[PDB]
Amino acid sequence: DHSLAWDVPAAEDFPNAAIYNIDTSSESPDHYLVDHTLDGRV
Amino acid sequence: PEEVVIAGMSGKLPESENLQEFWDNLIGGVDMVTDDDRRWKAGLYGLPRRSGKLKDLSRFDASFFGVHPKQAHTMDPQLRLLLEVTYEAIVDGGINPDSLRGTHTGVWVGVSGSETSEALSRDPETLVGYSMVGCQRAMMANRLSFFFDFRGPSIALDTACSSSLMALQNAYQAIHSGQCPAAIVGGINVLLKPNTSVQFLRLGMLSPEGTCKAFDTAGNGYCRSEGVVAVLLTKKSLARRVYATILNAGTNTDGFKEQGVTFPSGDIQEQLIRSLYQSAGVAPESFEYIEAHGTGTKVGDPQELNGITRALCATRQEPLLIGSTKSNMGHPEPASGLAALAKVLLSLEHGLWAPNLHFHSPNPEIPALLDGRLQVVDQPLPVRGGNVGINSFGFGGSNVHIILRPNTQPPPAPAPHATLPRLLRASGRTPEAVQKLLEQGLRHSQDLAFLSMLNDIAAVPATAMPFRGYAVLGGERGGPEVQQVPAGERPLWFICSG
Amino acid sequence: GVHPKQAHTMDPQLRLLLEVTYEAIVDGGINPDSLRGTHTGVWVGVSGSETSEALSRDPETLVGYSMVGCQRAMMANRLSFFFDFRGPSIALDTAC
């Protein structure tokens, strides 16, 4: 008995704002930001 | 050890709703790879315009298999079609499914995709828990065991495109050692996410023309296709219908290769073939037909064919027929083995070998084809008789090989009771199924075995199948009757006349 | 012997499993070379292919190496290929 219709995923169901992390640790590439100190704060 | 026999068979392949339609397409030379854009827009992301696609993925008799509307809507199409195909396969051999309930039957399923789980679980805010139960890859066999009440192992294997034959080999191992009185082997592959096709295109496997031209000089790549196939295995004492007997099934991995992970090594395949047919005690001459992998690649085909030539054609004086089911329906990755097995079994049953398409010239790198040692089936041929070999190789590096002995049981000689009228009873979800069974039984009134097997599968409680109908055969006043059986048990009273 | 581009597109499960398998073989006092060419088999039980779903989300920029390094079957075939194991190499899927 195949009278009904059941959901089947479509082509649009699958993949097809910007977040920037500022890490001042030694290994991180943004380390130079620790040299921008004003009033004794970074 | 105990004999293992392939009893049932069923599946839904490209442009083929059942096995009869699949065979009608195979013999007639119909091309089951289509250019229509059903799954996704044709030519998307540069993908080939062709692919072997099933006719419909949105039909499921939920009431029968105990799935509520919400659960059915959140179940993988693979699982729904696989439940239906499994019930079809178990009854194909004449075994009533309720006769295996509570036994030690096992379910081995070969699958390599779970796209539905990825699609349903994308939104964390509005997802449903029971989506996992119907989409988790482990549930592609656990659900079958749950419905059919099988106490044996329930596993799902990937095996990297050789999964169907891997599951078949594991089921053969289980039945051979007496652990499982039966086994349900199935393979399912459905194309839903174009990203996977893009990945395969990037790897350099798909063909720009979308054709799996195997054994040919213009082999570029294969055409991804869908497919659901389930096969029932049983010890010979249980099987009513025997399609064939598995003489030996094995496996082995190519191991390290200088070329890389995705380069086949024909020596390993030759070793597998030789070891299998030496352990099984079957001389190379007995082989009549070889179901090569036939992916249509530029490197895999020569290696596979040279390995086959060294393993089998070393001494035989008669040419060994070769062929691939992928020239007709493309290449279903997980279910490649089951499609080949279905083709071989149907060809044996109908007495002819299904021709292979897209074969015009032989690849110069294979000397066997240029010579007469190996002969490709470019047009229908009768079956002389002999063992049949099926081998499936995955791009990961896995290998599988099965040696099948065809079932050759001549029709019985006429008997005095043959002319006697017989009774046929049928049961179906709707009157259409009962009428179909009755009509088919009418068209074969003289086949006692067919009628008996149909009768064995007609004893289902009215709750599951609320329609019924009989048809007396061999009588002048012969006409089918159907009606809807009411629910509720009814006492059976007797009366003796005076 | 995994090139850097292939390494990045490789499932972390496989990356750790290679090392853990080598540590387990040597843990038993066996040299992983004496098993090379044998019919040793590999059985891996996995239930998640999250890495593949992440690497195949942008068809414009996705690379095809992720198929080899992130497929569920490759969680055993990679081990069989590196250690040169000729035995069965499957990837079971039953959960728990």
Side-chain angles (χ1 to χ4, degrees), chain B residues 7 67 82 125 196 289 338 468 474 482:
Chain B
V67 170
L82 179 45
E125 295 181 352
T196 307
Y289 186 85
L338 284 188
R468 289 184 163 181
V482 187

Side-chain angles (χ1 to χ4, degrees), chain B residues 20-323:
Chain B
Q20 182 62 7
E21 212 171 11
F22 182 63
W23 167 255
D24 284 337
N25 291 323
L26 288 181
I27 181 179
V30 174
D31 195 329
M32 290 172 291
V33 175
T34 58
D35 194 8
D36 60 70
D37 57 338
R38 293 200 295 261
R39 300 303 189 267
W40 57 70
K41 179 181 178 64
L44 187 61
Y45 307 120
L47 298 168
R49 313 182 68 93
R50 295 158 49 89
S51 295
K53 305 172 298 299
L54 304 181
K55 202 169 305 304
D56 185 0
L57 283 176
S58 62
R59 299 299 171 176
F60 182 52
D61 196 328
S63 298
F64 186 90
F65 295 101
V67 170
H68 281 304
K70 292 184 179 180
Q71 177 67 101
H73 273 328
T74 317
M75 198 176 307
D76 193 21
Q78 296 184 174
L79 190 51
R80 318 198 288 245
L81 295 189
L82 179 45
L83 271 65
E84 291 185 354
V85 174
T86 305
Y87 186 93
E88 300 177 1
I90 292 186
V91 302
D92 188 1
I95 292 72
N96 180 268
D98 296 333
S99 59
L100 291 181
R101 300 184 66 93
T103 56
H104 227 75
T105 310
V107 187
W108 281 272
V109 176
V111 58
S112 179
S114 182
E115 319 174 22
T116 300
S117 64
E118 175 184 1
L120 294 183
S121 68
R122 66 191 204 270
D123 175 66
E125 295 181 352
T126 77
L127 62 80
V128 296
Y130 43 72
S131 61
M132 186 165 54
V133 166
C135 298
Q136 185 68 343
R137 184 179 305 192
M139 299 300 300
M140 298 304 175
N142 301 141
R143 292 305 299 261
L144 300 186
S145 297
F146 179 86
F147 169 76
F148 295 100
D149 193 323
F150 293 162
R151 305 294 163 78
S154 61
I155 311 180
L157 327 171
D158 192 325
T159 311
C161 183
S162 58
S163 193
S164 289
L165 270 182
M166 187 63 57
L168 185 63
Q169 183 254 328
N170 287 338
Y172 161 86
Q173 200 71 11
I175 306 179
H176 194 239
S177 59
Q179 293 188 188
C180 301
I184 291 296
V185 181
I188 54 183
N189 190 23
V190 298
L191 313 192
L192 295 174
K193 199 175 65 177
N195 305 84
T196 307
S197 292
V198 178
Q199 282 191 320
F200 274 106
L201 175 67
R202 298 296 164 78
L203 260 184
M205 299 178 179
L206 300 194
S207 179
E209 319 305 344
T211 68
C212 181
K213 298 172 296 183
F215 305 91
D216 197 333
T217 67
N220 324 122
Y222 65 82
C223 175
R224 291 169 46 74
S225 302
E226 304 173 348
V228 185
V229 191
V231 178
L232 169 65
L233 290 67
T234 58
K235 54 177 182 177
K236 189 181 184 305
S237 63
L238 282 156
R240 328 296 284 172
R241 173 215 301 269
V242 176
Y243 283 99
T245 304
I246 302 178
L247 290 182
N248 209 336
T251 181
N252 70 341
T253 302
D254 296 352
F256 182 90
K257 320 177 214 60
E258 297 299 351
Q259 289 69 7
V261 174
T262 56
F263 179 88
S265 59
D267 308 324
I268 311 304
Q269 310 170 8
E270 168 191 352
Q271 301 180 6
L272 167 60
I273 300 179
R274 180 175 300 111
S275 58
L276 288 182
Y277 85 78
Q278 289 181 339
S279 181
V282 169
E285 305 80 13
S286 58
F287 281 88
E288 163 190 342
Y289 186 85
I290 185 61
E291 178 80 11
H293 197 5
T295 183
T297 58
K298 177 163 295 302
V299 293
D301 279 323
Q303 292 285 315
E304 177 183 358
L305 253 48
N306 293 327
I308 299 178
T309 299
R310 282 189 292 269
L312 297 179
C313 300
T315 75
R316 64 191 299 96
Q317 297 299 349
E318 176 177 345
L320 173 62
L321 309 179
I322 201 165

